[PDB]
Amino acid sequence: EEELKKLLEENIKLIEELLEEVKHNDPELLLSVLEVLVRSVHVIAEVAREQGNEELLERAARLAEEAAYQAEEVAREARKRGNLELALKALQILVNAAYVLAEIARDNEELLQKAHELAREALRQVKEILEQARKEGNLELVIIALRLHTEIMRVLVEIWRHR
Amino acid sequence: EEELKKLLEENIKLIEELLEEVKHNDPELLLSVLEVLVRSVHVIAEVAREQGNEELLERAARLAEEAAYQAEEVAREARKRGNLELALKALQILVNAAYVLAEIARDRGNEELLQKAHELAREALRQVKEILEQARKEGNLELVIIALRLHTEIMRVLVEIWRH
Amino acid sequence: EEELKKLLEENIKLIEELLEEVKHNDPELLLSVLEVLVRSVHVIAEVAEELLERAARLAEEAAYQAEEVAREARKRGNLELALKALQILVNAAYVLAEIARDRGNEELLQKAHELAREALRQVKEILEQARKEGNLELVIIALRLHTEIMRVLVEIWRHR
């Protein structure tokens, strides 16, 4: 009756194999795998609240935690290389990983706090890109940064709602 | 019989007339209108469950079913013509049409509709699986991303079917 | 435990300062920030207040700017920016209706309804025009918009 149980394991396995395969590839391609990963992790959380499966939550929490650091590494290197566009994309996947991590926390304060620092770090990083973008005079890039700035803020209010 | 009821009928008339017009034109435009069809059906299902218009459930479910089969034919032809992107794009509207069909099935209690949506997901899973091995063979890592993105979305449909 | 209040004020302050500066710049750029502006007002859902009235006012001002760009776009003959501008109008109407139900402002609910009702009127005109002009691609964009006003208008009915 549980055909999705095979499909659930099949999906993460294909993503994890791709993630290791794409690790050496272009950062933009790496961000694409992380985008699908955090999109996948949300449904593994959605299919563990329906289940009594607490073990599946630990799996999704580890993958969301690992996806968070991967987005952070690409964000640090991209900003160092001068690419604010690819960098700003990385914080987007970073906060998205933090958002699902906060959802994973509900039904462990340490996971909620861990997701909080992930969101807090993202807000700190985008602030540097936003303030820098205003200095460079690129109003178009400030929109993307301000668009992101709202998204971390929108996520950050949810942690308060989670208490 | 409110004022929104007129807007619902007005929307389906414009969608149905366009769908027949673009069938002979290009699949990409046909996919765009088909995408709105499942988007429109989702909002019409939410107001027929709220207004208790059980007749509208059959109408909205039929349109999602028709959008599913229309998405499937263009998905089948696209893979035959070698356009895996348009095929993978078409499968997205298919699973979304299957998703709303599964959601209507669980609410209305139509066990036949739940399996029909289930087979739609099974068909979509077969195509992406075939596309995935093909995309991996040609070395197009970009296409496996779209396929894995689609593959993940199929799981969301299977989660809802089990919830019934 | 009100650490977000600084970030909340920082978001509205950064958006409002940018919104006033870019208004005279490019219409496409003005529409994009208005999308972020209407996205920013959504954070007002957290009702702790005095800041709620400020953010609700900002949504009112963002609504008219999208309509003004929509009017000029149709006047300039570019239906594309109009449908894009009309799109941001409907989200502004959507967020305005949600804020109305929080404080129970029945006048705001009818006001937000009229923006969507008018937005459906313009998009209906563009749709018949786009089909008449033969730009089948624009009819999809117009029909794409048409669904969203219906989704917002259906939600407004769910309130009353």
Side-chain angles (χ1 to χ4, degrees), chain A residues 4 7 10-12 15 17-19 21-22 24-25 27 30-38 40-45 47-48 50-53 56-57 60-61 63-68 70-71 74-75 78-79 82-83 87-88 90-91 93-102 104-105 115 117 119 122 126 129-130 132-133 136-138 144-145 149-150 152 155 157 159 161-162, chain B residues 15 18 22 24 27 30-34 36 38 41-42 44-45 47-48 52-53 56-57 60-61 63-68 71-72 74-75 78 82-88 90-91 93-102 104-105 107 109-111 115 117-121 123-128 131-133 135 138-140 142-148 151-152 154-155 157-159 161-163, chain C residues 3 10 22 24 27-28 32-33 36 38 41-43 45 48 55-56 59 62-63 66 70 73 77-78 82 85 89-93 97 100 104 112 116 118-119 126 130 134-135 139-144 146-150 152 154 159:
Chain A
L4 158 85
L7 191 55
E10 192 175 345
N11 168 270
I12 40 172
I15 293 174
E17 292 144 61
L18 189 65
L19 191 34
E21 153 166 28
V22 79
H24 321 80
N25 265 56
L30 189 79
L31 280 204
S32 269
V33 185
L34 301 162
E35 210 211 298
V36 173
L37 176 49
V38 315
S40 170
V41 164
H42 204 98
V43 316
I44 326 299
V47 71
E50 256 65 8
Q51 286 170 102
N53 201 325
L56 207 54
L57 285 195
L63 275 193
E65 225 173 4
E66 154 63 16
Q70 280 284 340
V74 160
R79 200 209 274 199
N83 197 345
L88 268 176
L91 307 90
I93 305 170
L94 193 168
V95 53
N96 284 339
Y99 179 68
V100 84
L101 211 53
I104 288 288
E117 333 288 14
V126 58
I129 319 196
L130 180 77
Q132 175 183 328
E136 318 218 347
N138 187 314
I144 317 312
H149 178 46
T150 318
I152 298 91
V155 165
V157 315
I159 293 77
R161 309 222 264 223
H162 282 101
Chain B
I15 274 159
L18 257 166
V22 281
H24 293 90
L30 176 56
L31 278 189
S32 315
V33 47
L34 272 185
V36 190
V38 317
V41 152
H42 210 298
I44 278 186
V47 77
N53 186 327
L56 250 203
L57 282 292
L63 290 182
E65 152 209 44
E66 191 52 42
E72 197 204 332
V74 304
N83 188 334
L84 271 43
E85 247 206 286
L86 179 73
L88 272 164
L91 291 179
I93 312 95
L94 187 150
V95 47
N96 292 336
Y99 184 66
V100 59
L101 274 202
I104 300 191
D107 263 8
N110 197 326
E111 215 79 68
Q115 68 163 24
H118 187 69
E119 300 173 350
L120 282 189
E123 180 58 14
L125 183 72
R126 270 184 250 149
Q127 295 245 42
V128 51
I131 285 169
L132 253 175
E133 101 175 350
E138 324 219 324
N140 189 318
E142 283 148 59
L143 261 52
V144 305
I145 297 271
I146 317 191
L148 286 207
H151 180 295
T152 304
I154 303 204
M155 272 185 343
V157 158
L158 258 52
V159 156
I161 299 185
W162 159 22
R163 265 195 252 151
Chain C
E3 274 64 31
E10 251 307 346
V22 303
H24 328 286
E28 286 84 347
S32 44
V33 50
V36 200
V38 172
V41 314
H42 226 305
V43 316
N78 180 296
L89 159 60
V90 193
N91 325 96
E118 181 145 279
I126 318 186
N135 171 350
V139 198
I140 275 147
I141 311 158
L143 177 149
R144 262 203 273 260
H146 181 17
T147 282
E148 287 289 324
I149 308 107
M150 153 173 111
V152 181
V154 155
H159 289 82

